[PDB]
Design a protein around this ligand. Structure first.
Ligand SMILES: Nc1ncnc2c1ncn2[C@@H]1O[C@H](COP(=O)(O)OP(=O)(O)O)[C@@H](O)[C@H]1O
Lengths: 216, 288, 72, 144, 72, 72
């Protein structure tokens, strides 16, 4: 999602997110009969409301978790969100609105590509993102994750970590392919420092060594 | 001049319906205008309010789409606006209240006080706006809602447990349009009336209990409340005005993490409550 | 005599309320007409908007469908 | 599946594609009765409604991948769609009337024949498409 | 299934075919009660209305493919 | 002429059933007014019920909203 946002502000365009995959029911993009006061209960015209202009950038999270098989298949409930030759007038085939989507730039986010319906897969192409090494995790933790966590905890210049502490946290407190679990651990160290500030404040900075990571 | 002439008009309407009712026959408008004279409220709220005061001066008996104006004004005129309880967030005063209303449970109290300290310090940017919201998980029989009360009286706030647990849709978390036969406010807006201030706590019960029918799942309007960058921007179908829900503080209890939706899992940290020992159980049984 | 009095006073007060109304009172009909005519707009949805407006012009209150066509 | 489009364009007729892979219910070949809520016709009447003619070219992809679990058996409802003597009176459950599917050009694709149930394989004519040599792959890559 | 129409043409009877393959709804044989909204009788009464004669030939085709255990 | 006649029928009936239903007026309404007061119902619901009765007392009888109020 951060890479999608980077592409969006690179083009001076808007950004908006539409989640999928949580569809236990089959057809919520659809576009079935009037339980909604409007000819589209699906997410697309609401997202077109929330964006003010004609040409947004839209993401779609987890298009590959439409495997429910409950009163219908959510995998069988999508072809025409995209694919810009039919997409000049949008359709749900049961309750739709003819509306132009030929100016919107679409991105798609999936986890495992072996669940997409096959008319949708052959229209799309794939970018594969592998996974991080521990030196990549240490560099990301120095340059992006730790400043953001000490900002939003209100400490911002009275507590610091060293590189040994970062490597110890990654090696002994996380098992993941990403950086989402490391961010919570850095946040816990910041909030621990906050409670120690409010229960007797010191002066200056205190650098957190490799020995104090069990103490936090 | 136009005021005095419309005073002629309004008194005329008075006298005529007075004749028809056998009583003032418009006692309702005389009550509700004096109700609009209350504390608050913002001007767009009153501008939405004043359109349906003056519609029941056309019909009085019925209709199923006219009595709803009376019910709606009576419901609108009783939400708290701008009434702040004396807050206190002291890490040596909350600690005493928690250590009196319970026995044992050191680590979970400490991990609560950490959250409280960051609730305290961050009064600048992102007052909790990227601080993850609190949830408590564990088996049944451990003290969880008792911790909600023990925190809520440690800030002099109002505790008011709101329980989903059996939801069919997110269209009951958010209210529904008043012009139908179903005219109901949010479970949360009712819940907002039950307190006497504008900043209570609202605990949530078994949030890992979700829906599969009435097409959808309520992980879409629930996140619109739990996110402090969203709750000030909250709009309900019944009142149709933006009502501020930022100043309130939420506690949540669930029993398992493995069926909570991912947009909600990415907004919270967990405090696993372990289970007791025989001497802990013996002390709780003797004391409480 | 009482029935005729009832009818006269009834529509007298309703005519008073109409007169106490200028610009069709609040008059959301012309408000949504101005909300149509000042933005966009394509041509088939112009016909759809005007027919939904004309469905709103006939019935005024009592059915859920009038507010349904309003929201729609 | 590209040869279906080229066949339809080569004869100046209409094309529509239905993906039968992962179809687990027979309620989407023939519809539901109109007494339920929901209650729409099956995919064939949707396909015949998109197209505006009675003799299009319908492509039915991956008929070897329909399934037969508790969810249902859509291969038993296909037996009256593809019956060459009896599909001139096709009734789904939404429309109660018989509807004539004897003019449409069904084209079907699969990878193996061992998973099609035998009373359904009996109705269809089989054409095997072989696979390419390296000389053929060079020619295809050079001029297409 | 060719003998069905051949036999009915031979004896000068009427003919109607009901295809039972894959049907797993009990309300396709009987109906629903007339309390429900779109309710109407089953396939048998419908076939007897189409024929118009008390005496037809009905072909109940592929009766061993009646699915079970979904609603009933 | 026929429908004004039937209006007249119902209003002469209304006068006679004033002159027999109660010595002054429908006496079962006064029986309800006493019976609401006798049963020990709480005060909010008594205000509710007396408001309904006061509204009902001005409806014309034989009306599809008089019967709803009287049954309630
Ligand atoms: N120190 C304590 N720890 C846990 N429970 C306690 C303690 N003291 C009293 N109790 C009682 O134990 C009961 C457990 O019920 P509850 O907390 O509702 O369980 P749960 O929250 O798991 O549903 C509470 O009613 C509470 O009154």
């Amino acid at each position: 999602t951060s890479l999608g946002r980077s592409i969006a502000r690179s083009m001076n365009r808007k950004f908006h997110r539409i989640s999928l995959g949580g569809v236990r029911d089959e057809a919520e993009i659809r576009g079935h009969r009037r339980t909604y006061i409007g000819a589209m209960p699906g997410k697309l015209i609401h997202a077109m409301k929330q964006v003010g202009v004609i040409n947004p950038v839209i993401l779609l999270d987890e298009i590959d978790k439409m495997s429910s098989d409950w009163r219908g298949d959510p995998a069988s409930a999508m072809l025409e969100v995209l694919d810009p030759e039919q997409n000049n007038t949008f359709t749900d085939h049961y309750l739709d609105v003819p509306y132009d989507l030929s100016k919107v730039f679409f991105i798609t986010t999936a986890n495992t590509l072996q669940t997409i319906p096959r008319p949708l897969l052959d229209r799309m192409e794939v970018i594969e993102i592998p996974g991080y090494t521990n030196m990549e995790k240490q560099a990301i933790a120095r340059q992006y994750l730790w400043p953001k966590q000490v900002r939003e905890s209100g400490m911002e210049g009275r507590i610091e970590v060293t590189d040994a502490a970062i490597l110890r946290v990654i090696s002994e407190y996380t098992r993941e392919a990403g950086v989402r679990g490391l961010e919570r651990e850095l946040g816990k160290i910041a909030r621990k420092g906050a409670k120690f500030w409010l229960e007797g404040a010191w002066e200056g900075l205190r650098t957190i060594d490799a020995s104090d990571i069990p103490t936090y | 001049d136009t005021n005095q002439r419309e005073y002629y008009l309004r008194e005329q309407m008075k006298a005529i319906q007075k004749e028809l009712g056998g009583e003032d026959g418009l006692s309702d408008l005389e009550a509700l205008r004096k109700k609009i004279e209350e504390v608050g409220m913002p001007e767009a709220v009153k501008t939405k309010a004043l359109k349906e005061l003056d519609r029941l001066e056309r019909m009085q008996q019925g209709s199923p789409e006219a009595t709803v104006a009376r019910t709606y004004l009576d419901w609108l005129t009783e939400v708290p606006w701008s009434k702040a309880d004396p807050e206190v967030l002291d890490i040596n005063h909350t600690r005493q209240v928690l250590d009196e209303d319970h026995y044992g449970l050191k680590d979970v109290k400490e991990r609560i006080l950490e959250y409280l300290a960051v609730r305290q310090l961050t009064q600048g940017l992102d007052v909790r706006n990227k601080a993850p919201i609190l949830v408590l998980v564990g088996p049944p029989g451990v003290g969880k809602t008792s911790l909600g009360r023990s925190i809520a009286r440690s800030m002099n706030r109002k505790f008011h447990r709101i329980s989903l647990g059996g939801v069919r849709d997110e269209a009951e978390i958010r209210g529904h349009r008043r012009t139908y036969i179903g005219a109901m406010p949010g479970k949360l807006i009712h819940a907002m009336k039950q307190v006497g201030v504008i900043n209570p706590v609202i605990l949530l019960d078994e949030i890992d209990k979700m829906s599969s029918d009435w097409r959808g799942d309520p992980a879409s309007a629930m996140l619109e409340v739990l996110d402090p960058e969203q709750n000030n921007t909250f709009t309900d179908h019944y009142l149709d005005v933006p009502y501020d829900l930022s100043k309130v503080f939420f506690i949540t209890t669930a029993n398992t993490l493995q069926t909570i939706p991912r947009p909600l899992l990415d907004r919270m940290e967990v405090i696993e409550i372990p289970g007791y020992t025989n001497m802990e159980k013996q002390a709780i049984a003797r004391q409480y």
